[PDB]
Amino acid sequence: VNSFSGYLKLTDNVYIKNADIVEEAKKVKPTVVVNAANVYLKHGGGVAGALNKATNNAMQVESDDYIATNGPLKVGGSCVLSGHNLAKHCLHVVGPNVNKGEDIQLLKSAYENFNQHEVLLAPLLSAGIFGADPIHSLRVCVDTVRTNVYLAVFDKNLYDKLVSSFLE
Numbered sequence: 001v002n003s004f005s006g007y008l009k010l011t012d013n014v015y016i017k018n019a020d021i022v023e024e025a026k027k028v029k030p031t032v033v034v035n036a037a038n039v040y041l042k043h044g045g046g047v048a049g050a051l052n053k054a055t056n057n058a059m060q061v062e063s064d065d066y067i068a069t070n071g072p073l074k075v076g077g078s079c080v081l082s083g084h085n086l087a088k089h090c091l092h093v094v095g096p097n098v099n100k101g102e103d104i105q106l107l108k109s110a111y112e113n114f115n116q117h118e119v120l121l122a123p124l125l126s127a128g129i130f131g132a133d134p135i136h137s138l139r140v141c142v143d144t145v146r147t148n149v150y151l152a153v154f155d156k157n158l159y160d161k162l163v164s165s166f167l168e
């Protein structure tokens with residue numbers, strides 16, 4: 001469990017790797033994988049869609065049941081559901097969608113949810129269709145998360161920009 005390999009330590013507790021988060025979950029067998037969720041837990045693309053596809057749609061079926069029973073999450077909020085074949089747990093975290101006018105200050109609230117878990121495999125929050133600057137998202141992660149977070153970034157050019165941002 002939690003067999004993280006080949007990460008670069010950026011801070012006392014934040015690590016980064018140029019990797020596919022689904023292939024990392026399969027290799028590492030983490031206690032927790034973080035999903036970059038939306039408030040209705042509709043896993044239609046990006047990391048959410050990739051995680052769901054790797055679970056053979058189990059995540060989406062579980063999420064649909066959760067939302068019909070319990071209602072939507074809030075921006076900045078989270079829920080813990082099954083990790084299925086990826087992890088023990090999946091922490092579904094909703095970062096703000098600034099492309100849709102939501103407040104970037106809620107990215108702090110989103111990352112605060114990571115402090116309820118000793119170690120996490122995670123993507124950067126509010127990246128991709130959520131529209132936040134990835135360098136800013138890494139900064140908020142570093143400033144907010146105090147537990148051990150292993151970040152997976154798929155795209156090499158973005159990984160390099162983030163690592164350079166950070167150590168040069």
Ligand SMILES: Nc1ccc2oc(=O)ccc2c1
Nearest residue numbers: 003004005006007008009015
């Ligand atoms: N001190 C240190 C630095 C980097 C690391 O990256 C890993 O993949 C596993 C543990 C680790 C420990």
